[PDB]
Amino acid sequence: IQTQQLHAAMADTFLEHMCRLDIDSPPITARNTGIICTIGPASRSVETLKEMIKSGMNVARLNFSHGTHEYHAETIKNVRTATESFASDPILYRPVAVALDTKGPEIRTGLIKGSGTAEVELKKGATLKITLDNAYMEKCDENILWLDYKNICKVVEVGSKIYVDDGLISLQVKQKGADFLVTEVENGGSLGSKKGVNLPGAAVDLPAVSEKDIQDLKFGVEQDVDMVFASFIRKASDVHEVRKVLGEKGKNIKIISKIENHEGVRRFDEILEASDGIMVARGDLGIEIPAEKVFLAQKMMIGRCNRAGKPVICATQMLESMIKKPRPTRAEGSDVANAVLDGADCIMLSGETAKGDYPLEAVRMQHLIAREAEAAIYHLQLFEELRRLAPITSDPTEATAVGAVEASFKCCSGAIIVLTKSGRSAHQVARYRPRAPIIAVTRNPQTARQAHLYRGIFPVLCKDPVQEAWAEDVDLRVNFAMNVGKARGFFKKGDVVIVLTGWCPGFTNTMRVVPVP
Amino acid sequence: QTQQLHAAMADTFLEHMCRLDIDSPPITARNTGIICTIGPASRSVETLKEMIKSGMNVARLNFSHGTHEYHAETIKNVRTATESFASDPILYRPVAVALDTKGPEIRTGLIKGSGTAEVELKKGATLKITLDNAYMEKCDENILWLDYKNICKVVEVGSKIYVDDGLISLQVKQKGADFLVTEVENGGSLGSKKGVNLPGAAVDLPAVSEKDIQDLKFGVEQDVDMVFASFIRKASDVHEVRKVLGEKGKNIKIISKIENHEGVRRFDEILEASDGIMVARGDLGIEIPAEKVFLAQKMMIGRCNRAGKPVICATQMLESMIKKPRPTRAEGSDVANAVLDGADCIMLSGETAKGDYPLEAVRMQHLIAREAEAAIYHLQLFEELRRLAPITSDPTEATAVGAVEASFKCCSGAIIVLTKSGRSAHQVARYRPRAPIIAVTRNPQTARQAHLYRGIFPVLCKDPVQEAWAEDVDLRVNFAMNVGKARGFFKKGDVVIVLTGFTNTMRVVPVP
Amino acid sequence: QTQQLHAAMADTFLEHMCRLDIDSPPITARNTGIICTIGPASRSVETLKEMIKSGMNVARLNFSHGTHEYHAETIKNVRTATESFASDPILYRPVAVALDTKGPEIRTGLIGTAEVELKKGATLKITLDNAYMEKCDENILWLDYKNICKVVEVGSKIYVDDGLISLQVKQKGADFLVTEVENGGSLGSKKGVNLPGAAVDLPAVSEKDIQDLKFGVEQDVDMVFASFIRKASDVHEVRKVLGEKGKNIKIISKIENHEGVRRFDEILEASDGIMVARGDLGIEIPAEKVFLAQKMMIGRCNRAGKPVICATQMLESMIKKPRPTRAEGSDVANAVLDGADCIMLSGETAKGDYPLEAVRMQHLIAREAEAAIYHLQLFEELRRLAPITSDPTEATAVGAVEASFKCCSGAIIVLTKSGRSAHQVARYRPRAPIIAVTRNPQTARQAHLYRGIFPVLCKDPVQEAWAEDVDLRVNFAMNVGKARGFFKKGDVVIVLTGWCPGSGFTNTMRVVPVP
Amino acid sequence: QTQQLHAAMADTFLEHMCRLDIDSPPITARNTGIICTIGPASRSVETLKEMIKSGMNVARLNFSHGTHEYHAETIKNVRTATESFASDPILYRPVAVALDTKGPEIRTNICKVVEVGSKIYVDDGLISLQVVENGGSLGSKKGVNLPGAAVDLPAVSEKDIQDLKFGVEQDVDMVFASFIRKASDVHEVRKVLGEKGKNIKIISKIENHEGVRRFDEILEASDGIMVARGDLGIEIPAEKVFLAQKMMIGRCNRAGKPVICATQMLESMIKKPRPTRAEGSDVANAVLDGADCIMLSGETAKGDYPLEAVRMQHLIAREAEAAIYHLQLFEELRRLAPITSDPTEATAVGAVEASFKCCSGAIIVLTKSGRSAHQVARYRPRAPIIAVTRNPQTARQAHLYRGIFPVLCKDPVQEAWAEDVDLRVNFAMNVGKARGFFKKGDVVIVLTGWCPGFTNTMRVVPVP
């Protein structure tokens, strides 16, 4: 039996491509889809972080909706300690990126009985009074809930719907007031502490980048984070507000815009052009818009991101049951596989790794599903379509990238080795979605960390000193990439690989089809 | 724009995705059938009436549990709620009845103590699986009885044993002809009569057991519309089910359930022998690695679409809705991608049998499937189905593919097909048109069995046969006109396709 | 297998080419209409009879020459030869009459069959003095375009005999032109003249054209080939001249210059059809660009569902020889493969020595080319590019063609009054021949403009029961296909009819076995 | 826009036709080679010089007429005219020499192969006979065709053996083998050429039904194919020739072997200064079919306007090359290409893909034998392939492939391979600039090796 679903790859129709998908055809060793994991109490120790990197974590996500600046600074220190514990072997060292997820214009409840882990049961048809009196921030119960959004009574109306936690608890405003709302519980359950609140039909007037967000962003600039997941972005000027706060010191920090509402979907095109990447944050999105329409927004945003060549992240509840169970549901396995088939550069875990009981199992399961799904990609149709929709340009590097991907398909290349300084040449290869893994050799540690945003880029950080002869320096990094693929099992001596370098000390314009040793 | 028609005109699948519009409302008609498992939560006539209104098309009865007395009351309640809408044939919705056989299953004994007595299995503990029937009703943390008497002949040291949907995992360390000491790998609250899986073993249990025979015969007496045959491994298994149904139940459809590696490997011969396929991801996710299930699902749905047989994607599609009133983002995506794969039917098993939100589950499947039907890249699917269609001289196939083509060119409100056995309407559903298929029939069984096919909206006509054949056809056609008008599928001045008669007449007619 | 069905099953156009089999015989039916120019070599009733037997469907009358009496006799002979087969409606082939306009032509003077040798590099003076009209020589030349000096410039090119003689304008006199011969040759009398880069100021419809068009309305012509159409307003002038009496006369606009190509879209919308008139076009634009205009116009006509004619010099060597050249054989096949509804002969039939051999050769090539069409790709593209509409006939038509591919129908039988339902089927280009049954003799004749339509004229009286009248005409189409070899009983065909007497639209499709 | 780039972006072939623009000017480079038959009208050194200036790439010598001294002289005039431009290596265009064999010809055991009622055709099918049907003017020593008969004449006669060895001694670049009917016939030609002429390309001419029926054996055994429509149009029905032409051109494109469309492409230009509309369509459609080369045989040997015929083919081929639906053609050639791990094929297809992405002005290929240039032309790029070589034979033989513009580098080999590469690459830059293919600032694709022997390096560089 052939491997990597190569029999399905030869199908002349997408229907026959489906008919040839073989569970007995093993995939390749390399996994092209990046894995972003949210760090929390269940994954903050250096010990867990080490195994998580070994399990397939590429980006550590820090959710600034919780915790103080000292809490996150320790998380960053632990991430770097666990990551650098493998730095002794540059061939096996896997770079790990650090991502700052902003709180954003969030609405959160108060503390229930005074404990963040405490909870209180709610019943259907019961009455719960929402208050803005700060005398009940930590005195929330089954009858009084405190909110942090002071202007709620001016944006919701009688008969409006209010959702708590992840849309699980629903409330309808029956009575209004100056600083209180009397709502009826429809969908009862356990109400916890500091849970998220959504007002779908309302136009929340909270700042896209609040003062806390500005302070949190400056903290990220000082901690040398690699990217920013900016929450509740609904327009391009919001993306710009984040970039100005990052200022000159953080020019190279990637801004990933999170689409979590209808306006963000409506204004997606202007948002995508202004951002470095997009996150389909299905948690809030699944509450702001009807649940049955979320898959339309996901496939649309991933499609437009592939067309523009910018990274897109599918996130939230991909393996939600693994928070309490060691194995996912069949729906969860399909969701991860379908996200990769959609064309998502990265898949995310947020809860399965931050607080769940099986954080390692969740990361390995994502690694396994993404690997199987990448082989099931209909590369024949995907590559030609990406070719037909690519604007014609006289940029020599873009021609080198598409020429490398085409050559990698013709000879079934073991890898595409790209020597890059900023990552751009490597990104231009990933935009055409080659089957072969992209080994991006760089001396810049930031671009090595940021390379995980693009599908298929395996960044390797060269710590060897710069040779005086440029041809020797190039040959060093290529040989460095050769040893990485050999040691990681991507290729072996005698296999064929594509090598992307420059010809003279500017941009990658040289393409070589070389044997491995 | 509506029906995602701006995306439907894209010349590339990538642009078809880019044009998916959450503000583009779908049509009223919902093409994908919804099969619901009946249990304590949805067994009552009053709840069953709401189930039909919520969008339920097929009632599924899991014979792995319950007596014949229990299921006969379920079937009695299903027909009572269904026939309570029979006073209006325009609005009457036919509901099929499906029997899910137990099959070659492996289940644990009753834990010691109460019937609800559960035990706890801790990771790093030992457990001795036994056949001694003395512990059949005396299971605990140390001993555990199984109903598979040949387990010691197919398993060896180092193999894995799964209990309770693979949530509990065991590793056998020392094997004997009577005892099997094992090491708990995961662990959890272990209950009674829980299913057991042996992935690396070749279980030699009968495909159609003694209990399966009496259940199948019982299904024939209860006039069931279809049978779901569990753990079908080879085409010879399908023939055994057909043999039991015999002459009395020759018209009952056999939907083979693929649940193991052997069934996937022999899917071609199983599909040829069966009337349909159920991708039963529950056991399949335990018999083969979980990360490979989506390959088997997309393979089986594709091959069934290629063969024109109905395929069902099942199990845990909206699992979190058992306890919660809203699904997860992965579950909403799982339903949509199942419909985008090409699945004729989607199923609920626990979300409707024992869950706290059975009507919400059905309602959610209705919303996602209708939304996913409009997002189907009909342009590429039709071309590929035509190209890959086996060449025939059958006049009925040329008429069927002509009606679907004509339904695209004019974006018809529906395709009205007059049929007795349903084969005419099935030949239209094979090419997967966007417009709904209003299949008018007088055969009650045909109207119930029609739910297995995508897009077929069956309507039962109880009018007597007129002497003049042209008089009778015009009545059935007008009965379909009033149905599509009442259900909001089309309106006066809209254009629909009519298929009459072998079926050889195709008409484009404005709605009166 | 036959009709290149192995090449038709190819999944790529390259493999479709690789499977083209010279040993795969085509079907009996020929879908491309053949238009033949009548002249001294083909005007007799006897010769016209053999032309119909050889495959002639439309008779073209070139009104650049001949008087109204000469042409009236031609039509009488055409109708005499055509009606000589009227005794058997099963084998009767309708024949159309087409009037080719004189148009804004420029013609030289008179030099008694006298010929003058023009030498390269010599000086040739073009004058407008009507005193040199009958005295044309190697030194002085007279034209009938009295406004030539105001539209041509110094350095412009002038062509004098179907592009054979080339001239370059060196000086611009008060009422004359001083040119330099570039491509010399034998200069005759009253030869056509082309001014490529100039904006000719001649009326689109001249006084002679008005009378010749009125003559066409009175002689009951089926179509008009309107010469040198350059804009939509020209087509309207032709439509207004035809008036109410000739409202149903199809106007085929002839594209013969750059402006006609540049403004093609406005011309096509206003016309009933298009002719790629490559004679003048090959002189007004560079010859190497003509195939670009030909394939563009044929493509846009296929997209709009309007008839297109490829014309001029398709078998030019057959004027003097009994066999065509390899370039001529390829040209006809490529015109059919491009998507042309009709192919034309103009000279190979009017004055050549082998008029019948030219008609049979077009019939043979068109039949072979029709089988080599990549119907798989063509139908898919025509399907994807077809505007979505709620017209019941359009849905029925595309459904019939789809069904004919699914079952390899032997034919598509269409019952039509005006021809529209048959035209709507032909626009999707089915492989099977379309048998259009009609009682209207004009729609039977005009149907030859559309590819694949085999018109048959039913002379039986209208039955009182509509179902009997439908069954009569359908059975008539069955006997026609049987006698002509389109199918044998047991074959499958598609039948397009109405549903009620007086529905007003073709809405019923039946896949029936052949009687 | 230019080069029919608006029509190139169409998503369907029908829309590609609808967008063909007579006002969209083509590029300067002409990719289709032009083969001209030399005769009394084109043998002078003066005329041959103008013939090269008009666009002639291959000189064809028809050994059906003339003695060895006539043909030996003709080669001398061709080489004299060709080398008259050798003083400037940037403007020198190599010219190939082709030997067209007489073959098993019949000209005015016949009684043992025909029967009563059989057809006999004389001249170019102009006179018909039944054992007179189509009368006419009969000349001396005219060709005769027996369509339904199985002629038992030797595939390679004694005259052919002596004529083929004569080609080996005159250093011809290729042989046009007439009336090839089987693979064993092609092998007979290779044996006569022997070891001394192993590198002489054999182009098999398909002129009868058996040749079409046995086409697959002939393509595998030959270096190239000629659709010789003259004899083919008499042996098989005239209306069926376009089927054989499109079949043979397709199978050659699939196999990556050169194919020549020949005979009567501009036949009326023997006596007239302008072609017919059918002739213009024939040349353009042959290029659209995928023909590597187009031929003239009579329009250049004896006609009154040999130069005008060469320029007209040059103009039509350039116009037709822009009208090719490259989008579908490249995708189909890619999907139908056997999967291989050969770095040169991966390098070649990557260069063609990159040339489409940046609309490159040229694809510069540094090659010794021509293989790397041939592998690029098989994927049919829109951009011209400038093949830089030091081998003079491969420069002449490169004209058989569509799009290859050969340039002969006479500069000495530099010691550092990087300097030799930079020398030859800049040589290609000066050639394309001097010919108007590109200008400074344009982008081109450069194909070289990586070490001082497979071509594996591709560079996307601006024109200096």
Ligand SMILES: O=C([O-])C(=O)[O-]
């Ligand atoms: O913020 C998020 O990640 C979300 O809403 O899922």
Ligand SMILES: O=C([O-])C(=O)[O-]
């Ligand atoms: O006048 C014409 O018909 C032409 O130019 O072909």
Ligand SMILES: O=C([O-])C(=O)[O-]
């Ligand atoms: O001999 C030839 O070249 C021909 O017949 O075309």
Ligand SMILES: [Mg+2]
């Ligand atoms: Mg956050």
Ligand SMILES: [Mg+2]
């Ligand atoms: Mg005229």
